[PDB]
Design a binder for this molecule. Structure first.
Ligand code: HEM
Ligand code: HEM
Ligand code: HEM
Ligand code: HEM
Lengths: 145, 141, 141, 145
């Protein structure tokens, strides 16, 4: 994946990210924008409206977990495969989440980063991050591939 | 196939863009080219470098088309017919590319309209762009 | 919107299916379940074994709905109203699955109508099923 | 990805396949059903009509080549990755074929097998071949993944 250069750029920027905040936002927007994904979180309660979703405590919390998993892979950018083995098993083997959804979440995260950092989130920076979500998505769908 | 709520959200959002449509059109292309290099294959003879007057110009063309679409949310087919002919029949652009440009455009808007780019607005703009893409990929004939 | 040529092709093909419509819908489900095992997750209450009567029964229902769309190629959205609600709004079926069932349907038809399943008929049915899928995934709200 | 029983089943059915006929028909239908794909076969002449396409000799010609590729893969159902590594660099790195198209061709070939074998092409046999086209497409797209 990422060169050392790109690795550093991404790594440096990640440090400005508030996982609590961005995590809940990315998960909430995924359920809102691609409503079929709600079927997997039925348990989380009220997801009836955009507002219900975005204010859902379970959504905010789960969102946190997701970004944390993102933080980790950032730390293991060379072996996403192994970093995500256990998650690939939960998602594919147990949940049977279609791998295209993994890509949808990655893209939503990028939209959320753009919204929160504005001009700081440059085209080049975005490009780096796209490589990353791509790597994350691939590593998770491995139980399929 | 946009609900009234969707149309109101798009109209509202595009209104905030106002006079920056062209600049946003250009940045969206740039983000696309950078993030998804393969798309560069459709512009063989375009300097796709940062600041190229060709990206600039092109960004302004796309923005114009989108404005046209926004003003004709009731008849996109009719609004984008010439472009379907161009993109699908003439250029034979693989349909996956429409999704890359749509994403790039959402990234651009989000970056420039943080307070306006609410989850509901994002949902509506995502649907609008998909509808626009559906029309541009309609005449594969 | 299908061309009149496309519509003639669909009408003609379904015509040859005729009285086997119910058996082909059942076969299409069985092929989907076998080829793409994840689709089985939407029917945990079903006996999904070869020759199951639930599957056979459901197959008759799928065929019936396709017949209805064929007899209403001009108002698919109108004809498939409650179905969009059920699939998108109540069941929240992931759009990818629609492509899997379409494929299963084309394989079934090709196998039973080799002579009639020409490149042209193939393209028309492909477009038909896509339209059908689109309507069924319109009401996710 | 192919159990021993699956491999055997697939192996034996293939013996009856007329690669030449099947190949041209498969490539032809792809160009007809998914027209953007003609972008890559500009150099084949007239692709203007289904008729021009199905009967185009370069198409038929190129189609048999493709099938020959399949057969070899059929011969190494264990190393599709290795078997296709060269074709992967070609299609990806040189031609820039979106990997979604690899899947489309695999599906089209299945439809062609069905049209040609009718009854003999059972749900089970079909299921076995779906596994096969998926393994080939994966192997072709790895230069991406
Ligand atoms: C980059 C993509 C994704 C990452 C990194 C990710 C990460 C995670 C993590 C860290 C967990 C928590 C496991 C634990 O309890 O420790 C989880 C669980 C879960 N994920 Fe994801 N996820 C991704 C995409 C998706 C998508 C697209 C869906 C569905 C549309 C999904 C559905 C779920 C569900 C339903 C759970 C578990 C809920 C529960 O068991 O309480 N995930 N995921
Ligand atoms: C929302 C989606 C899109 C819109 C609104 C759009 C709009 C336009 C417009 C307005 C033009 C110029 C037509 C003219 O006046 O000459 C154009 C041309 C073109 N578009 Fe798009 N387009 C879209 C998607 C795409 C995508 C996804 C690609 C490829 C990745 C693409 C590739 C091209 C090319 C290659 C040209 C011709 C450039 C030249 O040779 O001058 N378009 N598009
Ligand atoms: C060509 C597209 C499809 C058509 C025409 C179709 C048609 C139908 C019909 C007629 C029913 C029964 C509703 C009733 O009469 O009560 C139904 C229900 C259902 N469909 Fe589909 N369907 C399609 C695609 C799918 C897909 C792709 C899936 C998921 C893999 C799916 C999953 C279901 C489920 C889970 C039910 C409810 C089963 C039950 O009755 O318990 N459908 N569909
Ligand atoms: C299962 C999927 C596929 C397989 C197994 C396959 C296999 C092959 C083979 C064996 C060749 C011949 C190379 C030679 O002359 O040595 C080839 C060439 C080519 N393929 Fe494919 N292919 C697949 C899918 C596709 C798709 C989806 C497209 C584009 C829509 C495509 C476009 C081409 C082109 C343009 C060439 C010409 C190469 C040249 O001779 O310059 N292929 N492919």
């Amino acid at each position: 994946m990422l060169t050392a250069e790109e690795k550093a750029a991404v790594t440096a920027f990640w440090g400005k990210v508030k996982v609590d905040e961005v995590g809940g936002e990315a998960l909430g927007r995924l359920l809102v924008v691609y409503p079929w994904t709600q079927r997997f979180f039925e348990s989380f309660g009220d997801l009836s409206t955009a507002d219900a979703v975005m204010n859902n405590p379970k959504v905010k919390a789960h969102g946190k977990k997701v970004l944390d998993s993102f933080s980790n892979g950032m730390k293991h950018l060379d072996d996403l495969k192994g970093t995500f083995a256990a998650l690939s098993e939960l998602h594919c083997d147990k949940l049977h989440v279609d791998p295209e959804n993994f890509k949808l979440l990655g893209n939503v995260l990028v939209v959320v980063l753009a919204r929160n950092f504005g001009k700081e989130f440059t085209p080049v920076l975005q490009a780096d991050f796209q490589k990353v979500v791509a790597g994350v998505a691939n590593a998770l769908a491995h139980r399929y591939h | 196939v946009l609900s009234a709520a969707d149309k109101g959200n798009v109209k509202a959002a595009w209104g905030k863009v106002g006079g920056h449509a062209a600049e946003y059109g250009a940045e969206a292309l740039e983000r696309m080219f950078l993030s998804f290099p393969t798309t560069k294959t459709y512009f063989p003879h375009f300097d796709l470098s940062h600041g190229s007057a060709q990206v600039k110009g092109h960004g302004a063309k796309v923005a114009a088309a989108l404005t046209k679409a926004v003003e004709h949310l009731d008849d996109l087919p009719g609004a984008l017919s010439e472009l379907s002919d161009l993109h699908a029949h003439k250029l034979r652009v693989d349909p996956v590319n429409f999704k890359l440009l749509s994403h790039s455009l959402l990234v651009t808007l989000a970056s420039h309209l943080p307070s306006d780019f609410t989850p509901a607005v994002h949902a509506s703009l995502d649907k609008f762009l998909a509808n626009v893409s559906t029309v541009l990929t309609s005449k594969y004939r």
